[PDB]
Amino acid sequence: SQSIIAYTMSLGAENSVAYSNNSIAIPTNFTISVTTEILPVSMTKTS
Amino acid sequence: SECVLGQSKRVDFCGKGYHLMSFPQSAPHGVVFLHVTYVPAQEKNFTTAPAICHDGKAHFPREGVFVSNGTHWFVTQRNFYEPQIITTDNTFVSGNCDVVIGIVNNTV
Amino acid sequence: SECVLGQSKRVDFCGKGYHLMSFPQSAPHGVVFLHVTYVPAQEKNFTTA
Amino acid sequence: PAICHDGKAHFPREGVFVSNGTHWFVTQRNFYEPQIITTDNTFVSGNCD
Amino acid sequence: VKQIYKTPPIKDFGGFNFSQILPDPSKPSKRSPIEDLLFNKVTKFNGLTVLPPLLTDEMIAQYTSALLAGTITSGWTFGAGPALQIPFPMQMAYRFNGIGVTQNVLYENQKLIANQFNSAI
Ligand SMILES: *[C@@H]1O[C@H](CO)[C@@H](O[C@@H]2O[C@H](CO)[C@@H](O)[C@H](O)[C@H]2NC(C)=O)[C@H](O)[C@H]1NC(C)=O
Numbered sequence: 001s002q003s004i005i006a007y008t009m010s011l012g013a014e015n016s017v018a019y020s021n022n023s024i025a026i027p028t029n030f031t032i033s034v035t036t037e038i039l040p041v042s043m044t045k046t047s
Numbered sequence: 048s049e050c051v052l053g054q055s056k057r058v059d060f061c062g063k064g065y066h067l068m069s070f071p072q073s074a075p076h077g078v079v080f081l082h083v084t085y086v087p088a089q090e091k092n093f094t095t096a097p098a099i100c101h102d103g104k105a106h107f108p109r110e111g112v113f114v115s116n117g118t119h120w121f122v123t124q125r126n127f128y129e130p131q132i133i134t135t136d137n138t139f140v141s142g143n144c145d146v147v148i149g150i151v152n153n154t155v
Numbered sequence: 156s157e158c159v160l161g162q163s164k165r166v167d168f169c170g171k172g173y174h175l176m177s178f179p180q181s182a183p184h185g186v187v188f189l190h191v192t193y194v195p196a197q198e199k200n201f202t203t204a
Numbered sequence: 205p206a207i208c209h210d211g212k213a214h215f216p217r218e219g220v221f222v223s224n225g226t227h228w229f230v231t232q233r234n235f236y237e238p239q240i241i242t243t244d245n246t247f248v249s250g251n252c253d
Numbered sequence: 254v255k256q257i258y259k260t261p262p263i264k265d266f267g268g269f270n271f272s273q274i275l276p277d278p279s280k281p282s283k284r285s286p287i288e289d290l291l292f293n294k295v296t297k298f299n300g301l302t303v304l305p306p307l308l309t310d311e312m313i314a315q316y317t318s319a320l321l322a323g324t325i326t327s328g329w330t331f332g333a334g335p336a337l338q339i340p341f342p343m344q345m346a347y348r349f350n351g352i353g354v355t356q357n358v359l360y361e362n363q364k365l366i367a368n369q370f371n372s373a374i
Pocket residue numbers: 020021022
């Protein structure tokens with residue numbers, strides 16, 4: 001039961017933030033994040 | 048030069064996070080990289096201070112932030128919670144106790 | 156990436172001085188920057204070694 | 205990367221530790237200029253293992 | 254920004270006039286005083302027309318402000334991991350340490366630091 005709908009863009013959830021002056025977050029766990037970049041170096045050698 | 052063979056901190060250059068490494072691959076008409084960064088996964092909110100107050104002086108971490116909860120104070124880095132003892136080997140002295148905001152009295 | 160969300164030491168890259176911080180603003184057809192740098196104001200000649 | 209002393213791991217503050225088979229000394233990655241390990245040259249944390 | 258970050262509800266920028274930089278909520282056009290100044294100065298049937306942007310001036314300002322607000326009070330901590338509660342004065346202390354300048358300058362001259370940025374703006 002699909003349809004096409006136009007919407008206002010949210011551009012992502014708003015990250016509601018505020019801060020105190022006596023406490024800072026400090027990491028207990030981390031990850032090794034590996035991603036892939038695909039990049040053009042050369043064009044077909046048209047002659 | 049900066050991610051495969053080194054550790055540049057240019058922001059988001061080889062992906063978001065701190066650069067660790069990068070692995071180039073061949074491709075038709077191009078290059079492929081497997082980019083690797085360090086990104087914090089879980090963090091906790093710790094009471095903190097810029098300095099420890101001792102004999103009227105301010106003892107600053109050489110690097111990092113002081114952890115200041117309960118009955119014990121320590122030194123951690125912004126990128127990792129591994130608390131160290133408050134000694135002259137981990138801290139340095141400058142300024143004073145009337146300068147630092149949040150400075151906490153502790154035996155150094 | 157380097158002056159706004161950062162504080163680059165690229166020399167005089169976003170303006171003369173060491174970058175401390177920078178802030179972008181919207182514009183028709185472009186981006187406006189407020190580039191904040193650290194610049195020595197006073198110095199004195201000390202005998203050194 | 206570390207030496208074991210009094211049950212703790214002692215790490216070069218900067219550099220790598222080297223042994224000539226008689227002594228352990230801090231050297232740097234960019235240059236072999238040996239320093240006897242003392243608390244001025246090494247940082248202590250965790251445990252030896 | 255991975256997601257648009259909110260400008261904190263409490264404008265604790267250490268006395269800095271970020272209200273001149275970030276969008277003014279009281280206006281029908283959500284632009285900052287710096288932006289109003291520029292926008293008021295920087296400006297068919299013959300077959301040549303101009304298409305609209307996807308991201309409107311306000312939408313660009315929302316992404317821009319998220320990056321900007323993060324930059325001034327939290328840096329990149331709203332990106333690479335969960336947000337860090339660094340109060341503006343400590344963010345500034347770290348900001349100076351990060352360029353080889355002692356943190357004592359922030360605390361000893363907190364008022365002059367606040368005034369020089371604002372004066373320059
Ligand atoms: C952040 O700093 C402010 C400014 O000093 C602190 O506000 C003080 O709060 C105490 C506790 O109620 C009051 O007695 C003072 O009058 C306040 N000072 C001012 C200038 O208003 C605030 O406590 C700090 N926030 C945190 C979470 O520590």
